[PDB]
């Protein structure tokens, strides 16, 4: 028998026994293993179904948007300026955060894809021939020197990893290893940053993954141009421990588990079904 394949049902007949598979006790914390071959008469079914879609690698291994960055070729305010930054976190989007918060601890590699589009800013004229735009997405490790402005020396990236990409081609992509200092990524942290139980409470004190800096490598354009970089994360080689109950209430903040009080489900009119 293959692994992942669900169990077949055996044939059963009528019984008159002192055995009681239906009568149990859920006070023990034990979920009963009653199959339909215990409370009725079944036929022999050969079941070819497989649990391939339900694996942790298949359930997590889709690329999901985690951040939408914005930067222009000419500065109007801040935001948006000629460059922008992003502290790496998986908690600004609701879809991947709820998928990750079904487990307490995790361990995975990371594949990062950027979809960098561009559009012309609103002006009185647009007729201008422009060369192809080149972008840089520098990764600054925790503690390193951050770019203070445009044309800064820190974009020389002698040890920091950095990608260059010209518009029109395939999206860029690079793989990341497992970057935690402990043995697993903590999705939750019931604790504080200081030993006196003050400071920051929650998972914010544990996530320290560095920043991600974006800019145009072209010096200028004729007329200004806004640009949007979408970050896509796909976990791979995933391990997961201690499953949590699923999040019911909608999130409010990217650094907190805070919530407004919601009902447990939706309401109906009466507890009984009524028709014939």
């Amino acid at each position: 028998r293959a692994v992942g394949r669900v169990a077949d049902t055996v044939a059963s007949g009528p019984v008159n026994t002192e055995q009681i598979p239906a009568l149990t006790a859920v006070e023990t914390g034990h979920t009963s293993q009653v199959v339909p071959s215990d409370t009725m008469q079944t036929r022999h079914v050969i079941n070819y179904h497989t649990r391939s879609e339900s694996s942790i690698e298949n359930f997590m291994g889709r690329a999901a948007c985690v951040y939408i960055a914005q930067y222009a070729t000419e500065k109007v305010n801040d935001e948006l300026d000629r460059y922008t930054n992003w502290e790496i976190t998986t908690r600004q989007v609701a879809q991947l955060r709820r998928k990750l918060e079904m487990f307490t601890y995790m361990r995975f590699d990371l594949e990062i894809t950027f979809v960098i589009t561009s559009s012309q800013r609103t002006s009185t004229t647009y007729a201008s021939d422009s060369p192809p735009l080149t972008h840089q997405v520098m990764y600054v490790p925790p503690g390193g020197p951050i770019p203070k402005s445009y044309e800064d020396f820190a974009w020389q990236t002698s040890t920091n990893p950095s990608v260059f990409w010209t518009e029109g081609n395939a999206p860029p992509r690079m793989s990341i290893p497992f970057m935690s200092v402990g043995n697993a990524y903590c999705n939750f942290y019931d604790g504080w940053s200081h030993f006196s139980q003050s400071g920051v409470y929650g998972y914010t004190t544990l996530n320290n993954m560095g920043h991600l800096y974006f800019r145009h490598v072209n010096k200028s354009t004729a007329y200004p141009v806004n640009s949007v970089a979408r970050v896509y994360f796909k976990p791979k080689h995933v391990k997961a421990w201690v499953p949590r109950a699923p999040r019911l209430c909608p999130y409010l903040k990217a650094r907190n588990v805070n919530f407004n009080v919601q009902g447990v489900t939706e309401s109906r009119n009466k507890i009984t079904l009524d028709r014939s």
Partner: antibody, heavy 116, light 107 residues
């Protein structure tokens, strides 16, 4: 070091077009926003007008509209902040600050009164 | 509606105590800048991007502030910390910021 200072003006015979001069030359030329912060003796910090040298896209503020002309001249590297049709309220110290991420490179500020 | 300035007008602190700051803005923000205006010359830049740095600011200075309330907290005052502090926010009608948070050295 960003050189050097800004220059102050005295009371002029009425009706002329006043004009300051900011000698901000630590350039790094020329794609930046010279935002002109203003300040009264009541220590209130608001803005007068900015410019952009690559295009000419000047800006203003609701008290100093009609008219504060600030034309860019990169060969002189200067930045003007005087407003036409102004009144006697503008007795104020006049900053002419080049740009960075915040308000990093400020000016020393010149006080100019106007009346008769 | 809608005016924006610092919360305390005139404070007083000795070199050796806490200097915790509170401000108000008429519009929300993502970044926040903190300055120091001494009597006699132009002000200077002390904190950008709500925490990052300055040129001459020592390690004892700290800052925060998001949206409509700022906080540029000094952990320990010294004799070189007597200046007025104002905010900054770029807009789309910049708010405007405060006039400066006055303080005097206590003895």
């Amino acid at each position: 070091q960003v050189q050097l200072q800004q220059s102050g003006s005295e009371l002029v015979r009425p009706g002329a077009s006043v004009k300051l001069s900011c000698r901000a030359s630590g350039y790094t030329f020329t794609t930046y926003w010279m935002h002109w912060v203003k300040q009264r003796p009541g220590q209130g910090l608001e803005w007068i007008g900015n410019i952009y040298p690559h295009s000419g896209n000047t800006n203003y503020d609701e008290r100093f509209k009609s008219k504060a002309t600030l034309t860019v001249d990169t060969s002189s590297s200067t930045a003007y902040m005087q407003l036409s049709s102004l009144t006697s309220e503008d007795s104020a110290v006049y900053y002419c600050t080049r740009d960075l991420r915040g308000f990093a490179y400020w000016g020393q500020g010149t006080t100019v009164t106007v009346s008769s | 509606d809608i005016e924006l300035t610092q919360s305390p007008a005139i404070m007083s602190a000795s070199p050796g105590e806490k200097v915790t700051m509170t401000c108000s803005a008429s519009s929300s923000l993502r970044y926040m800048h903190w300055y120091q205006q001494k009597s006699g010359t132009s002000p200077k830049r002390w904190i950008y991007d709500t925490y990052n740095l300055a040129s001459g600011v020592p390690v004892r200075f700290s800052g925060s502030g998001s949206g409509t309330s700022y906080s540029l907290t000094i952990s320990s005052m010294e004799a070189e910390d007597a200046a007025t502090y104002y905010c900054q926010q770029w807009s789309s009608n910049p708010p405007t910021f405060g006039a400066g948070t006055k303080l005097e050295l206590k003895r």
